[PDB]
């Protein structure tokens, strides 16, 4: 079971990662700072998604990416039969209800607005790590 972290802000990226570690989670964390590299990983060279077939992974997704919108990755993921079952957790800046509703309708499992306050942000990630250890992350179809 792996954690796929799609975040472009390197500061948040390293903050999230270490607070996950502080939660006791020792799972492999594969990160991407843009949508292009993250999609290649989730869908493979041929973009079919089959490389994700049978994978047990959870994806953290910042909506604001440089080369595309996180929403696209969400739709792609929840549409493909080899990735859709992967729990997607939106972890982004905006707390725009329209954006929240849209994300859930697109298939997001959980949506989290990044707290402003550093302490609040680090604590939230830590809770996420603890919750992660409590949930069941399923493998996608083969």
């Amino acid at each position: 079971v792996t954690i796929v972290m799609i975040e472009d802000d390197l500061g948040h990226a390293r903050l999230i990662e270490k607070n996950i570690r502080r939660a006791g989670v020792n799972n492999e964390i594969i990160a991407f700072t843009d949508g292009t590299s993250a999609l290649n990983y989730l869908f493979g060279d041929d973009k079919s998604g089959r490389v994700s077939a049978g994978r047990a992974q959870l994806v953290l997704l910042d909506l604001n990416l440089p080369d595309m919108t996180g929403i696209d990755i969400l739709k792609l993921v929840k549409e493909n039969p080899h990735t859709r079952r992967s729990p997607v957790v939106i972890l982004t800046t905006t707390d725009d209800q329209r954006e929240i509703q849209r994300c859930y309708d697109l298939g997001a499992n959980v949506y989290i607005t990044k707290p402003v306050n550093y302490e609040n942000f680090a604590n939230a990630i830590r809770q996420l790590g603890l919750f992660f250890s409590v949930m069941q992350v399923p493998e996608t179809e083969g």
Copy 2:
């Protein structure tokens, strides 16, 4: 934001409830010990689900109910417009892939296998309550 707890085991129902409070969550919790009344509240007497339109609610669901199976409650909630946007957290005893994968395929936002150890069980709920206060719970369509 209302937490709808669908659990028939009175012992677990009381453990879940107090540990949610233990986590500092003061949200209204409406409990149902059978699936019938639970579906009644969620969909109404007309069964259209309009009673749920615009509601912001998280649902805790045990799959092992006395009058039906929670999986079908999940299927109904995730198919109807005024309840599908509601995050559903499966909280049950079983832990075999087939059930977990089916719940996610049916639309469950999260699946948590009840920890066997009472204390781990209580702590996990506390962990669930903390995460709840960190995530965004959307309102359903109108």
